[PDB]
């Protein structure tokens, strides 16, 4: 399965599944400072799933590793901000992260395999 470009539609498909998840709803759009006025004291680099989808659709990811770094930033920001490990929203982030990681592993493996096959000779 040595298609170097296949990761892109596989990531579009996985972002579609994440948007159906009720657990994604807090992570879809950038955090509102009005409601969370200390957010940007704690979080240097905001990230959300709409920004990830738009970066993908613009052709501004070169690999699924770059997409994976930005999605992992959504989850590390939720960890950096939770006032408690037992917060509702952090708890939603942990389930959504498990789902993401379960599905992205084959996307990454197949991409890396395809690049190695391209460089085989
Ligand atoms: C106009 C409109 C329409 C529809 C949705 C929309 O966006 C929803 C609000 C965006 N989420 C949000 O506010 N947060 C998500 C990220 N945070 C945490 O991860 C976190 C950890 C513990 C706690 Br508590 O929060 C901080 C809160 C905006």
From Swiss-Prot:
Modified residues (Phosphothreonine): 45
Parent-protein residues present: 1315 to 1435 of 1821
Protein name in UniProt: PH-interacting protein
Bromo domain: residues covered: 2-107
Post-translational modification Phosphoserine, affected residues: 1, 91
Tissue specificity remark: Expressed in myeloma and epidermoid carcinoma cell lines.
Job of this protein: Probable regulator of the insulin and insulin-like growth factor signaling pathways. Stimulates cell proliferation through regulation of cyclin transcription and has an anti-apoptotic activity through AKT1 phosphorylation and activation. Plays a role in the regulation of cell morphology and cytoskeletal organization.
Compartment list: Nucleus
Quaternary context: Interacts with IRS1 and IRS2. Interacts (via bromo domain) with acetylated lysine residues on histone H1.4, histone H3 and H4 (in vitro).
Organism whose genome encodes this protein: Homo sapiens (Human)
Phylogenetic classification of the source organism: Eukaryota, Metazoa, Chordata, Craniata, Vertebrata
Pathological condition linked to this protein in its record: Chung-Jansen syndrome: An autosomal dominant disorder characterized by developmental delay, intellectual disability, autistic features, anxiety, hypotonia, obesity, and dysmorphic features.
């Amino acid at each position: 399965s040595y298609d170097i470009q296949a990761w892109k539609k596989q990531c579009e498909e996985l972002l579609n599944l994440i948007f159906q998840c009720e657990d994604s709803e807090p992570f879809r759009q950038p955090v509102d400072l009005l409601e969370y006025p200390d957010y940007r004291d704690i979080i240097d680099t905001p990230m959300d799933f709409a920004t990830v989808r738009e970066t993908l659709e613009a052709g501004n990811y070169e690999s699924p590793m770059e997409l994976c770094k930005d999605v992992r930033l959504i989850f590390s920001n939720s960890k950096a901000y939770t006032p408690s490990k037992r917060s509702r929203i952090y708890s939603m982030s942990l389930r959504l992260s498990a789902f993401f990681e379960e599905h992205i592993s084959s996307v990454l493996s197949d991409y890396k395999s395809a690049l190695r096959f391209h460089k085989r000779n």
